Structure 1
Amino acid sequence: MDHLPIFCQLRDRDCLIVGGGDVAERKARLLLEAGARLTVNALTFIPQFTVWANEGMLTLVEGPFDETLLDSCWLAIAATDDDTVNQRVSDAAESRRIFCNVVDAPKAASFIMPSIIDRSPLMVAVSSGGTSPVLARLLREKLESLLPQHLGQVARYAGQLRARVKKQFATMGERRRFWEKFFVNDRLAQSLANADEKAVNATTERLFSEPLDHRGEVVLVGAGPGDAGLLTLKGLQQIQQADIVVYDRLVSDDIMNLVRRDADRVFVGKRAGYHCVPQEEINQILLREAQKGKRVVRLKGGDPFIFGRGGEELETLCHAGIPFSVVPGITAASGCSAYSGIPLTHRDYAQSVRLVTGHGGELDWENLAAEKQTLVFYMGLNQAATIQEKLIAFGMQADMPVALVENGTSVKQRVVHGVLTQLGELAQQVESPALIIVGRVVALRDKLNWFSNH
């Protein structure tokens, strides 16, 4: 151990920062967030320092380094770009035993300022010990995605339950399992952040009212079009806490490897081409397994409420009193749009975007063939030619640009394009899953293409 990490209480405690540029400002933002009684000493200050000074957040001392400024300080930071002046601040700080950070050089002075993950009162800090700040950022990034946003809410709330926990749970092992369940309860954390007193109570009691080993709930999660990177942070957090993951084929492999490892997996997808699971049964197992006290995650391709009906898999939960929630995901329209260089909206081209089903009651042609609009078809490859003919017939121009995006956002993403009179033809050049994009925005791809094609 080359450094001893410690967590300092800075509320209304004197601290000094020497410097007034951009580096000093970050140091001040941080110190202020911690509530320090801050004095900033520099030759010149950037605007944000004037803004704070003018709303009582800190004190400014314009001029060179005044050593007496350290006489009652608990922390000092050298943040000027003059190595000799920083040296004097450090020396003046060390002579009076004041922890000081020289910020240009990390191991020259008293303490290192680590990369922080703030979930107050819960906090994590990572340090390179001065070797690699790059590594520190890599860790902060990974740690931020793993700690839910409102984790601090439950850390703070735990206090108002400690007594009740010791009273119903008399064995240390039991009380620990309680906290393990309590600390991953994201719905409660959200309710507290929303100041939803009834749900906070409703969710607090279900925590004491249900069997200890039960964590019944259903979470609909949008996996995104394929790229594991397009999963949302909450979606990852939910996926790492699942007891059972119910998924279909449009959920990527990379996405599934992020699942927790012997968290049971239930493939409700269309097997070998011919065996798909009827919806009521998928609905029933989600309700059934949550009733058994399992944290159920329904992993859907793209987004849950856009042509992959989580609506159906949910209106049966809000009647068994099975708490539930929804984590939207990047829909194929958005993923493919961004990865093919085809904006769904651009300056003149259009400002009405339409997400339409492909192939009960069929297709409204001149609502479609009309324009100043961008058309995006989901599930329409076996109806591509039948879309071509029924679009030019109702007025759409034959030279209207079109494109097909297969396996959007994935390492095998294929993009093909041309003009409308080539649609059905370009479609027999692609396989499912793919989207069709009809619109003038398709020409923007010559200026915006950035992703590799296959």
Structure 2
Amino acid sequence: GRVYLVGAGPGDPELLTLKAYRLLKEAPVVLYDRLVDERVLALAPGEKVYVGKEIHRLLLRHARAHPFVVRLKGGDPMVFGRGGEEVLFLLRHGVPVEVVPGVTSLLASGLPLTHRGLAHGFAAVSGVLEGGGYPDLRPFARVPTLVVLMGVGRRVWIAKELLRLGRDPREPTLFVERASTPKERRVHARLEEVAEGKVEVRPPALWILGEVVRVFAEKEAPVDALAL
């Protein structure tokens, strides 16, 4: 049958799209990935099978057993999750696929990635490639606002490299662990501090570099005007 590649959002169940919610309530089977919040899953009454971490072959065998199935992925399925590969593989083996976009975690910090006088665009890059290798940061090194995903374990190397490539060592950066969940933890640090191995952060985390990080901070004191 049919396969819906659905974005679950960053975690907060209210950030699911209406289409995703309806599909989850209605789906006979939901094949979910890693980083899918238990809150989102508890909304699904059908059979819940974990697929991820050879994933292709499993998707195929459930898609055949039903009229349609939902393949659930964190955030938006088409960025940094190999969603592209799953789509190809499923089409190549005669299975229709309909992508349902979602709120990507790149947009879960609430910060304006673009802002007048600070950044007129942004870039997003992975700290880990398919196969486990290191990313080539040159093409991204100087974009006003840089967002790094899957970059916690390698934060020191990534920072040293960005510093090599020319970013301001004093640049403010923000790490946001489990954005949109009750375990959300923001860690502020300057690039240089990250390169010196001084910042404690655990995955999964959103890593944002650039002056925008600082937009909503009070003037008279280090206070998050928007958090309060």
- Does residue 323 of structure 1 match 2:96? yes
CA 289–299 in structure 1, closer or farther in 2 if over 3 Å, else same: same
CA 264–379 in structure 1, closer or farther in 2 if over 3 Å, else same: same
The residue aligned with 1:115 is: none
The residue aligned with 1:367 is: 139
Q: Is the 8 A contact 2:156 2:197 kept in 1?
A: no
SS in 1 for 2:175: strand
2-structure distance, mates of 1:259, 1:427 = 41
Q: Is the 8 A contact 1:384 1:427 kept in 2?
A: no
CA 229–449 in structure 1, closer or farther in 2 if over 3 Å, else same: farther
Identical positions, percent? 42
The residue aligned with 1:387 is: 158
SS in 2 for 1:423: helix
TM-score by length of 2: 0.88
The residue aligned with 1:345 is: 114
2-structure distance, mates of 1:426, 1:450 = 29
CA 252–449 in structure 1, closer or farther in 2 if over 3 Å, else same: farther
Counterpart code for 2:213:
V
Counterpart code for 1:367:
P
- Does residue 223 of structure 1 match 2:4? no
From 75, 79, 83, the counterpart of 1:306: 79
1-structure distance, mates of 2:85, 2:163 = 36
TM-score by length of 1: 0.46
CA 317–427 in structure 1, closer or farther in 2 if over 3 Å, else same: farther
CA 231–343 in structure 1, closer or farther in 2 if over 3 Å, else same: same
Q: Which is bigger in relative contact order (C-alpha 8 A, separation at least 6)?
A: 2
CA 312–365 in structure 1, closer or farther in 2 if over 3 Å, else same: closer
- Does residue 258 of structure 1 match 2:29? no
Q: Is the 8 A contact 1:404 1:426 kept in 2?
A: no
Q: Is the 8 A contact 1:374 1:439 kept in 2?
A: yes
1-structure distance, mates of 2:94, 2:189 = 52
- Does residue 233 of structure 1 match 2:18? yes
SS in 2 for 1:412: coil
Which structure has the highest helix share of the two? Answer: 1
Counterpart code for 1:403:
L
CA 346–295 in structure 1, closer or farther in 2 if over 3 Å, else same: same
Counterpart code for 1:217:
R
- Does residue 429 of structure 1 match 2:200? yes
**Alpha-carbon shift at residue 449 of structure 1 (Å):** 4.8
Matches within 5 A, 1:23-102: none
**Cα shift readout 1:259-293 (whole Å, capped 9, x = no counterpart):** 12xx1111124xxxxxx4xxxx2212222222223
2-structure distance, mates of 1:251, 1:225 = 8
- Does residue 446 of structure 1 match 2:225? no
SS in 2 for 1:315: helix
2-structure distance, mates of 1:351, 1:286 = 40
Larger of the two Rg values belongs to structure:
1
Counterpart code for 1:257:
A
CA 366–249 in structure 1, closer or farther in 2 if over 3 Å, else same: closer
CA 427–252 in structure 1, closer or farther in 2 if over 3 Å, else same: farther
**Alpha-carbon shift at residue 363 of structure 1 (Å):** 3.3
**Alpha-carbon shift at residue 366 of structure 1 (Å):** 3.8
CA 284–427 in structure 1, closer or farther in 2 if over 3 Å, else same: farther
SS in 1 for 2:217: helix
Q: Is the 8 A contact 1:398 1:420 kept in 2?
A: yes
2-structure distance, mates of 1:309, 1:380 = 17
Q: Is the 8 A contact 1:404 1:427 kept in 2?
A: no
RMSD over aligned CA atoms reads 2.0
